[PDB]
Amino acid sequence: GIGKFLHSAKKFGKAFVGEIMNS
Numbered sequence: 001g002i003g004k005f006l007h008s009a010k011k012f013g014k015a016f017v018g019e020i021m022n023s
Contacts, residue, residue, distance in 0.1 A: 001009050009017065
């Protein structure tokens with residue numbers, strides 16, 4: 001999400017999408 005789903009996409013999912021996505 002980039003509209004307003006980004007609010008948690010990079011607050012909770014920050015340690016997921018920025019982690020397990022790369023590795």
